[PDB]
């Protein structure tokens, strides 16, 4: 599952720059009022460097 | 953590705080607090924390 993807970090994952999915993850990850924290982890997989 | 910044009391109704804000901004820009922090929390102290 995407949860089981987001828990581990030994295989990295990402997406195409400026895509709708990219900005959607950026939006999800920064929002502290979000119910499901998973995106706030995945963003730190995608935002690296 | 949020909610909190440190502070110290002074006698009510004095001109002191009213004009200290910019002086604190000076002390921040000088890093004078950072010099005091290095003093009181030495980064290469007796032990690795």
């Amino acid at each position: 599952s995407l949860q089981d993807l987001s828990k581990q970090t030994e295989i990295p994952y990402g997406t195409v720059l400026d895509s709708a999915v990219y900005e959607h993850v950026r939006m999800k990850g920064l929002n502290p009022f979000e119910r499901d924290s998973m995106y706030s982890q995945m963003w730190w997989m995608i935002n690296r460097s | 953590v949020a909610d909190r910044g440190y502070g110290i009391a002074l006698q009510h109704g004095s001109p002191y705080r009213d004009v200290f804000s910019q002086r604190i901004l000076e002390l921040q820009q000088n890093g004078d607090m950072d010099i005091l922090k290095h003093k009181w929390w030495p980064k290469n102290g007796q032990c690795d924390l």
Binding site: L2, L5, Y13, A20, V21 | -
Partner: protein
């Protein structure tokens, strides 16, 4: 008329009037299968051939 993998998003509903949707939008992830782990000589493999 305009038609493609077009996604209803609120910022676009301000200038074009989408119909009712014909299918749901879903985010997914691609992976490579785990090959296979078992072979007939796995009991000899602790020594090189």
């Amino acid at each position: 008329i305009g038609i493609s993998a077009l996604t209803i998003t609120p910022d676009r509903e301000n200038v074009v009037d989408f119909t009712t949707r014909y299918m749901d939008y879903s985010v997914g992830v691609l992976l490579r299968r785990a090959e296979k782990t078992v072979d007939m000589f796995a009991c000899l493999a602790p020594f090189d051939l």
